[PDB]
Design a protein around this ligand. Sequence first.
Ligand SMILES: [Mg+2]
Ligand SMILES: [Mg+2]
Ligand SMILES: [Mg+2]
Ligand SMILES: [Mg+2]
Ligand SMILES: [Mg+2]
Ligand SMILES: [Mg+2]
Ligand SMILES: [Mg+2]
Ligand SMILES: [Mg+2]
Ligand SMILES: [Mg+2]
Ligand SMILES: [Mg+2]
Ligand SMILES: [Mg+2]
Ligand SMILES: [Mg+2]
Ligand SMILES: [Mg+2]
Ligand SMILES: [Mg+2]
Ligand SMILES: [Mg+2]
Ligand SMILES: [Mg+2]
Ligand SMILES: [Mg+2]
Ligand SMILES: [Mg+2]
Ligand SMILES: [Mg+2]
Ligand SMILES: [Mg+2]
Ligand SMILES: [Mg+2]
Ligand SMILES: [Mg+2]
Ligand SMILES: [Mg+2]
Ligand SMILES: [Mg+2]
Ligand SMILES: [Mg+2]
Ligand SMILES: [Mg+2]
Ligand SMILES: [Mg+2]
Ligand SMILES: [Mg+2]
Ligand SMILES: [Mg+2]
Ligand SMILES: [Mg+2]
Ligand SMILES: [Mg+2]
Ligand SMILES: [Mg+2]
Ligand SMILES: [Mg+2]
Ligand SMILES: [Mg+2]
Ligand SMILES: [Mg+2]
Ligand SMILES: [Mg+2]
Ligand SMILES: [Mg+2]
Ligand SMILES: [Mg+2]
Lengths: 25, 144, 129, 150, 99
Amino acid sequence: MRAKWRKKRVRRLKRKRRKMRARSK
Amino acid sequence: SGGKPRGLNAARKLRNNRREQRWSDLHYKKRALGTAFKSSPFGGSSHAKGIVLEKVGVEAKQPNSAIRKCVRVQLIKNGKKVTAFVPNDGCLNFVDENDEVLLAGFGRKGKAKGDIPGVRFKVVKVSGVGLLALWKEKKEKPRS
Amino acid sequence: VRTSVLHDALNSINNAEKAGKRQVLIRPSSKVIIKFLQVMQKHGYIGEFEEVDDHRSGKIVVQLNGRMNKCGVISPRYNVRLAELEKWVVKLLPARQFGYVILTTSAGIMDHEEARRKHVSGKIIGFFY
Amino acid sequence: GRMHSKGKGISASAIPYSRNPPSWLKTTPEQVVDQICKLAKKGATPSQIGVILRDSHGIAQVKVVTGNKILRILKSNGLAPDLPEDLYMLIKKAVAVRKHLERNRKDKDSKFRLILIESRIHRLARYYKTVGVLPPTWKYESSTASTIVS
Amino acid sequence: VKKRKNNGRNKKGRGHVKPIRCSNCSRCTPKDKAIKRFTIRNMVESAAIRDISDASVFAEYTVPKMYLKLQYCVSCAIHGKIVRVRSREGRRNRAPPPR
RNA sequence: UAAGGGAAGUCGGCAAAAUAGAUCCGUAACUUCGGGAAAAGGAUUGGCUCUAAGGGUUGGACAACCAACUUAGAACUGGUACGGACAGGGGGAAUCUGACUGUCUAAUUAAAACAUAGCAU
RNA sequence: GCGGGUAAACGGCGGGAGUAACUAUGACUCUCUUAAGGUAGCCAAAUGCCUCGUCAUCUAAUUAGUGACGCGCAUGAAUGG
RNA sequence: GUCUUGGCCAGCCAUGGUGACAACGGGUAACGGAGGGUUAGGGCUCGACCCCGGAGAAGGAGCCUGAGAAACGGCUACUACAUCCAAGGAAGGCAGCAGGCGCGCAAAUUACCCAAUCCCGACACGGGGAGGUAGUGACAAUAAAUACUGAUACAGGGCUCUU
RNA sequence: GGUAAUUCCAGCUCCAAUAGCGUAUAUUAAAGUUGUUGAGGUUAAAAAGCUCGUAGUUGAACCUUGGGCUCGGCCCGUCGGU
RNA sequence: AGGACUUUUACCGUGAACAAAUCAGAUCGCUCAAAGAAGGCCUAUGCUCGAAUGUACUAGCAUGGAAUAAUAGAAUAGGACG
RNA sequence: GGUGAAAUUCUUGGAUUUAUUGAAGACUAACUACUGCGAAAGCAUUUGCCAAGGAUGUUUUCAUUAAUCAGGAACGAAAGUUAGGGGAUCGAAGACGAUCAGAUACCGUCGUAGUCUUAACCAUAAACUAUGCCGAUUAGGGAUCGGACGGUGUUAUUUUUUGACCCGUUCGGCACCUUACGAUAAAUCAAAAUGUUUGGGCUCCUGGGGGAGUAUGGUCGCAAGGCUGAAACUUAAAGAAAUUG
RNA sequence: AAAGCUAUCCAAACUCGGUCAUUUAGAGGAAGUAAAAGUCGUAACAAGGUCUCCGUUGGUGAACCAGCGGAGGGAUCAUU
RNA sequence: UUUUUUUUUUUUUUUUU
Ligand SMILES: [Mg+2]
Ligand SMILES: [Mg+2]
Ligand SMILES: [Mg+2]
Ligand SMILES: [Mg+2]
Ligand SMILES: [Mg+2]
Ligand SMILES: [Mg+2]
Ligand SMILES: [Mg+2]
Ligand SMILES: [Mg+2]
Ligand SMILES: [Mg+2]
Ligand SMILES: [Mg+2]
Ligand SMILES: [Mg+2]
Ligand SMILES: [Mg+2]
Ligand SMILES: [Mg+2]
Ligand SMILES: [Mg+2]
Ligand SMILES: [Mg+2]
Ligand SMILES: [Mg+2]
Ligand SMILES: [Mg+2]
Ligand SMILES: [Mg+2]
Ligand SMILES: [Mg+2]
Ligand SMILES: [Mg+2]
Ligand SMILES: [Mg+2]
Ligand SMILES: [Mg+2]
Ligand SMILES: [Mg+2]
Ligand SMILES: [Mg+2]
Ligand SMILES: [Mg+2]
Ligand SMILES: [Mg+2]
Ligand SMILES: [Mg+2]
Ligand SMILES: [Mg+2]
Ligand SMILES: [Mg+2]
Ligand SMILES: [Mg+2]
Ligand SMILES: [Mg+2]
Ligand SMILES: [Mg+2]
Ligand SMILES: [Mg+2]
Ligand SMILES: [Mg+2]
Ligand SMILES: [Mg+2]
Ligand SMILES: [Mg+2]
Ligand SMILES: [Mg+2]
Ligand SMILES: [Mg+2]
């Protein structure tokens, strides 16, 4: 996997993580 | 080399820089943080005792085709669950459900050794009797 | 920015010596440089050195005879005790009978062997062999 | 090199070895100090005084002719400028950039140069306060720069 | 491994150079990196030059020459055989081919 | 107004009780950084005898003649009572909904409805 | 009438079958079909019949409350999410 | 007030004190040291523990006697734990020596004696689980059994000769 | 180790230490793999995108040298005094 | 022994003081050794050597050295000298 | 039109092509280079204004005022954000036509945000010379840019000055060519040399590969995100430069 | 001179909040690692069959694709 | 200058005058 889009996949996953935390908060 | 300071009054910088860079050393970092006391299945001890929960088989890593015989053991001292390898030919018969066994390190410093994946401990004694003694014709398993 | 004119002199000396040149131009001029040169000259590791006078820091032209292996400075100038000369000599020189470690003591710029005679110590500033 | 540029350019003036007035000068040290005082009284800066004396009146080096540099002559005669040359030109330059920067706001290159010009003033004024030329409470302020230069 | 001393272009000391478009790809490539050919050939082919001279009226007319500057990217020049892969030692020879 | 219990009553804490002034302390999540906030939660408060500070005018860090309130400190005192009547917030953790202020079915519905700024056509 | 544009115009936004080395599910495939087949989001929500849905929490006990799940009878983007 | 100095405390006055040269705060599976292990030099690491200093006697606080204690094989009170009882009451502190439970991978006899080292007492005389002796004891360390030898027969390496 | 196993299970033989040997964990040397002595930074990990700048660290040359008069101790030789 | 006149710091030399035990290390045939501080000699009468020595980084105390590294000095002379 | 070939698409309402003119917005070709300026990012039509800069020359002035910098601050491509203006071309997303087993792609026709500008953010790039800043020394050579100096002869002007060209010296730059007394593991390097014969000054970063530039806490941002930044666990290799196939 | 009693002081202890530090349960969600003869594609290594890679933005079962700007670690050290 | 997807696990070498 390209590191450019491994970074994009993780960055997308981080954005979803923050939404799940805002939901609980 | 490096651009380290070379003044006569730069001991503070030299000591501070060494203290910062010493954390990258894996073995000093392990000791300084005290990870053995924190995260290790043992409390930093050489051995530990536990109760055999079940017998499991572990497939050997390539290139090797065998079923390594192991047991799921719950440590008495802290309740953590680990997997322990049972060495020697046919020694899994001696171990049974709800037995009291003693575990030790398996190789070098908590890393799995050999073609056994994810197993980092070994069984030493069962019911207060050495596994080698049981495996040889030396001692008898307790009547219980 | 010039920080060690002594290092500049010895580096220029060593560069010309390795290139096989029989002379070298040294800038600038300092009391330490002249005294350090005279220590060379007493043991014969160099030849004539001539200082050119000017209305500023002077220049020195050193004639090299080719019997000079390595000359270097020590930074910083560590404070050396009498018991520490042997460790300094062992760790820094070749076999302990050819080279000479240069110190600065209350008696002036002078050798490590001379320190053992006069029973004095000070700060290491250079070496040669 | 330059303190605020890559600028590794060597260019200076080489003072001759003589330290002695040349035989073709027939001027008295009293006369040249009178020339120095007259020029300084008019308003000439000590840097400017040396240029006009050297170019027109044949004084190669005032120190060689007399024995004292121009500024020490001016202080002895009580005509030294209140503000040193070095700060006055640096502060005047900074004031010039401000009037350009007030009108032109998109000039981010001029903004960067002003920081360099200001940084030299602070480093310089720090040195003068150390030796005692300026009062220890002297401070260079952005809006008060024009007042000092006037 | 660094394949070439000049990387692949000529901009040492230039910072940034505006790009251009490849002649037959439209690829956006820097002007100094691109491979440029200046071609000067007769506007009529040599085979048909004689017939044009026949129709000359007005028989002293000289056929004009087309003046083209072709700019290529690396992929197009190599595929178009404008430039070819050279040996490790032969890569450093910066001389135009002789005539 | 009620002993003990304290919502077990009831569709539902409806009704009532509780808190309440001033001074000092302390104040969370969250946040549009403006708020939340009087968050939450504590301590003091009477009378009497004093002391101190905070000004003006006329004559040269002073002297004399006036002035009415506010604040602070200390003894003493009492069946430990003191915003002694009057007057005078209950609070917190969340969910749904409307952003808020505002408006309407005079005489059963004041609301989540209407309006609003903002956005768009 | 014919032809083109227009959805912050009114509005609309699909079925069936097979398939992964325990089983289960179906990333994948085939087919019918539409103007398009509901995207980002959200949910037994004032919108979910079955329904007192299933799991967890709250209580001694909860058809109530809250947090999750989602083939959602019949959620959903200025008919604004 | 104390044996005495001291913001140690009570009154009055002033706004100072520390910090990037790391103050303040947090962690320590941290009692400090003499020292143990291992290193050419420079170092790394450990130090509960036979010695010196500190602190504690289930957890805090208070106090009497006394030259000397905030004492605990002294007292008083509270919390936890726990013993006897006629139920009204009484009594307790093994991190002293043995021993038991628990905990754990992990550590000994409910023995003999003041004879030796010293301490204490009114004291030559008595007491001392300080201390010594013995038992368990593969912590570690030192020395050191499990075998010695003659001939006969055979083989090899030599020796004078290779008949 | 997949039907000729010098590696498993055994029999024989041999090797190392030997009243000891093995194993697990902690630490030290090896480790110039923490580098003050004494590491590395183009491509193996690593020069901040660039500049200014405080604390810190470091910072051009220059002031009594030269000569002589001597006196004594010790060391390197032959004189050796007993 | 009383006073006056000494630029001040860093650095080096020397000296005093600096628990035992440990460590290095001297001596003695505990049958050798680990250990221990004993012992040895005379037939005796009683006679005697020992139980050494080194180790105190850094901080503190006293003195000497004056190179090296810093800091002051007379400039609006408010300077030195009887 | 367009392509390997086509098709979607436009067209007797005259498409495409021809000539003239107008409007709009963007951009500044050829000149253009182993050339220049800028701290870097970057900077290419003319003219005027505003402020700045390096090199050069100096027998001007001050006299150590300096170097590098933890935190701290200014600038910082493209993309992206907020509010207006503009919106020609190109063109994420989207819709079709092909190809293909599929084609949510490469190819072709459209086409929104964007691309342009003012005000305010964002602070990241293979932001690269993958090579920190200051200083000294060390092999030769020729080009080239800016300045200065000396000489020579043509050319234009000239009350004999200046410009262009020629030769040489020197300072300061962008680089380059051969070599190794050296360096490196090697490729290669005039610095990556002057280092086991190891010390000129300063700052920053790294300690086998993953997990991971992730989780968490803090802080900055309207948001996207930026800066700081682990551990559990897992593994005997991952990796660099060359060699023969 | 005992019990008792007045007023300060030292202050255990408990209750009620606050803060710090360290452990620990949790439906469900989203990752990582390992184990191999699982399904689907073939993104990268050759010009890997659309050169590869970086920053940013958007989209798609998945590897990935596309727009803008950049780099060569390129498949060009070069065209007079 | 039309396109060309994939290849199940392990197994592939030692000494001296
Ligand atoms: Mg120094
Ligand atoms: Mg293997
Ligand atoms: Mg220079
Ligand atoms: Mg600087
Ligand atoms: Mg500054
Ligand atoms: Mg760039
Ligand atoms: Mg009821
Ligand atoms: Mg009504
Ligand atoms: Mg009503
Ligand atoms: Mg409404
Ligand atoms: Mg609806
Ligand atoms: Mg402790
Ligand atoms: Mg302990
Ligand atoms: Mg007591
Ligand atoms: Mg006991
Ligand atoms: Mg290394
Ligand atoms: Mg790489
Ligand atoms: Mg790298
Ligand atoms: Mg850089
Ligand atoms: Mg300094
Ligand atoms: Mg037409
Ligand atoms: Mg140019
Ligand atoms: Mg142009
Ligand atoms: Mg200029
Ligand atoms: Mg970066
Ligand atoms: Mg980089
Ligand atoms: Mg240099
Ligand atoms: Mg040049
Ligand atoms: Mg020139
Ligand atoms: Mg240049
Ligand atoms: Mg490491
Ligand atoms: Mg690592
Ligand atoms: Mg390779
Ligand atoms: Mg490629
Ligand atoms: Mg390559
Ligand atoms: Mg294949
Ligand atoms: Mg497949
Ligand atoms: Mg496959």
